């Protein structure tokens, strides 16, 4: 590849070491929330993001509480450099779009997922439209009451659709059933 | 990680380390925690990278280390070079006194027609130990699952934890590394064995290629083998101009 | 990597290609890409290729099973009507006897 | 295997061995187990690679070996070359005493204007035996096998 590949690899090794040191410092200083699911019958897959903090009650300073069992459960790796968690998701969606062939439902889902991730207020029409489409297709789950309103509206609108061929075939079947009923009536007419 | 390493300091430190690596095959950058109240990250602390401009002589690693990233190291000496007002601020930000002038080894050399120098060098000493300290196993009052907390971290919160739904279950002993930092000045120790929050030595090194020839490490860059020809070219051009 | 290789060896417009795409999507890590992962898992459960594990998975499976029986081909209904008319004509002949 | 050999040490050891092999046609790296409780792999043991920085002279194989990978060998001597404080740490790790200074063959040479040397060499001796030991045959209660 490039002429500086060995230096790039050495920098990657140094970055892995830096990531390890940063992970240790975060585990010893910050407040990492623990993810737990209630698994309630009414609510499925609820990521509560439980946190645990206790005050000394003798001084204003706080005290951290990090479990030892769930400290080291994510390894460090080397990748491209971004600036926020939204840019990473945008890049992954772009990569998946590149790998997904056109004329496929997955392509439409990826397009809508990309569109619902923009930032500027000028582009708000498309973000709202993409969110509405994703919610009405049932792929996403509503959060705020207007979203459940959209979902129930889509549910009501879905049942309105009728296939003309189904209705015509039903009419033909009803005609046949009526002919059979006429034959059975003719039997009783013979019986007198 | 994205929140902490987004500012200009991290990028500047990485760029400095890369340029050093390219010219002379060594570089480094350190991680320093600090207190911030206006815009904290998660708690009232912020993690920031810091640059080291001459890792060749300012950063001195353990001589027994064998890896490129110095994972198996127990010593690290950083020789700060700083001015008079810088020294006053350094004394103010710790509990040191600005009346006595510290001194240490001289990394730089007087080999240029420069006017003045700082002539104030102080050193920091990082060490790592393993002791297999104890830990408490509690019961989470929210969910009936056991949790483990180190005794040293919650040694002032034991009564408060007992006040809440937390109840102790058993006692264990888990080995864990610790990092201590001390400040030396070649005549006395100013601050002795401060407990750094980390578990590894913060300094992260980058190396030119690598190498241990017989028993001593050697590193190279790009300029080592291009010096004789360059000097010969300069000499020939000077002679022709004469 | 193995799923990517199998995708490379499989021609497009094939059920195997769709299965491999869903298997590749259901292996992502980040929470940003979670809607696609959930959709792929639901599709793989509803197509019967995988097996339900959590109660919502069996709920999806039984919902798909119920939705399957609702489908009716109009040609079937029309042909059944043709048979019913023919059988009624035969009954009319037997009544004439 | 993925969990054990994922860290930087394995990659560094392999890279050192490859560079050595390119320059002087020999290289090596050893596998060492250890005790760890914070993040064990399966049991309270972890397996890690370790680099050997001069396989030309520090690692000495059996003279009767005939294969490239030294599968049919019964001898292996590793001549450590290590510093005073490193020697104190080494004596603290095992049950040795740090008051007497060990000595051994000197692999390196004084062929450069070098200022100082460690001058503390110790060796490790590996051997392999086959003696046809015994074994017990039990019956599992969960499954009748």
In short:
This is part of a larger assembly, with four copies of chain A. With 192 residues, the first copy, chain A, is mainly alpha-helical.
Features of the shown structure:
mainly alpha; 4 chains; 192 residues; part of a larger assembly; two-stranded antiparallel sheet
Q: Count of DSSP E strands of chain A? A: 2
Strand order of the largest sheet of chain A: 1-2
The percent of residues in helical segments of chain A reads: 55-70%
Measured by DSSP, the beta-strand proportion of chain A falls in: under 5%
Overall, the morphology of chain A is elongated
- Using the CA coordinates, give the radius of gyration of chain A: 30 Å
Oligomer: part of a larger assembly
Structural class of chain A: mainly alpha
Distance between the ends of chain A = 99 Å
Number of helices of chain A: 6
Organism (chain D): Salmonella typhimurium
Protein name (chain D): Portal protein
Give your account of this protein's structure.
The structure is cut from a larger assembly and holds four copies of chain A. Chain A is mainly alpha-helical and 192 residues long. The first copy, chain A, has six helices and two strands. Chain A has helices at 5-29, 85-99, 105-115, 125-136, 145-160, 164-191; strands at residues 53-55, 62-64. Chain A has a two-stranded antiparallel ribbon with strand order 1-2. In chain A, helix 2 runs antiparallel to helix 3 (105-115) and helix 3 packs across helix 4. Chains in contact: A-B, A-C, A-D, B-D. The A-B interface holds A 6-7, 10-11, 13-14, 16-22, 24-26, 28-31, 36, 50, 52, 54-58, 62-69, 82-85 and B 1-2, 4-6, 17-18, 21-22, 29, 31, 33, 41-43, 45, 47, 68-69, 71, 135, 140, 142-143, 147-150, 153-154, 156-157, 160-161, 163-164, 174, 197-200, 202, 204-210.
């Amino acid at each position: 590849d490039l002429e500086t590949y060995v230096f790039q690899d050495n920098l990657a090794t140094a970055m892995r070491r830096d990531g390890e040191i940063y992970q240790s410092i975060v585990n010893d200083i910050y407040d990492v929330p623990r993810n737990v699911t209630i698994t309630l019958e009414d609510g499925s897959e609820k990521d509560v993001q439980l946190m645990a903090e206790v005050v000394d009650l003798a001084t204003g300073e706080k005290q951290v509480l990090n479990d030892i069992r769930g400290r080291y459960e994510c390894y460090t790796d080397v990748g491209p450099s971004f600036q926020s968690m939204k840019q990473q998701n945008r890049a992954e969606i772009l990569e998946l779009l590149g790998k997904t062939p056109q004329g496929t439902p997955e392509y439409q889902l990826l397009l809508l997922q990309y569109f619902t991730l923009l930032d500027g207020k000028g582009v708000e029409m498309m973000r709202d439209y993409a969110n509405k489409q994703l919610i009405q297709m049932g792929v996403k789950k509503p959060e705020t009451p207007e979203e459940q309103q959209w979902l129930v509206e889509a549910q009501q609108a879905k049942q309105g659709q009728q296939d003309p061929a189904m209705v015509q075939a039903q009419g033909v079947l009803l005609q046949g059933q009526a002919e059979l009923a006429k034959a059975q009536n003719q039997t009783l007419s013979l019986q007198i | 990680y994205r929140t902490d390493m987004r500012h200009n300091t991290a990028k500047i430190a990485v760029n400095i380390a890369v340029r050093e690596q390219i010219e002379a095959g060594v570089g480094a950058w350190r991680l320093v925690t600090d207190y911030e109240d206006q815009s904290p990250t998660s708690n009232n602390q912020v993690i920031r990278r810091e640059p080291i401009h001459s890792a060749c002589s300012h950063v001195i690693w353990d001589s027994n280390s064998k890896l490129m990233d110095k994972s198996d190291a127990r010593h690290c000496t950083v020789i700060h070079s700083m001015s008079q007002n810088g020294w006053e601020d350094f004394a103010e930000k710790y509990d040191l006194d600005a009346d006595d002038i510290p001194s240490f080894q001289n990394p730089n050399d007087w080999v240029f027609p420069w006017l003045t120098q700082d002539t104030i060098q102080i050193a920091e000493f990082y060490e790592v130990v393993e002791k297999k300290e104890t830990a408490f196993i509690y019961q989470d009052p929210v969910t009936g699952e056991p949790v483990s907390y180190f005794k040293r971290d919650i040694k002032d919160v034991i009564d408060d934890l007992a006040d809440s739904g937390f109840i102790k279950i058993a006692e264990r002993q888990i080995k864990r590394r610790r990092v201590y930092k001390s400040i030396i000045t070649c005549t006395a120790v100013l601050k002795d064995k401060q407990l750094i929050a980390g578990e590894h030595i913060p300094i992260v090194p980058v190396f030119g290629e690598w190498g241990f020839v017989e028993d001593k490490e050697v590193y190279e860059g790009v300029v080592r083998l291009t010096k004789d020809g360059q000097r010969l070219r300069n000499m020939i051009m000077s002679f022709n101009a004469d």
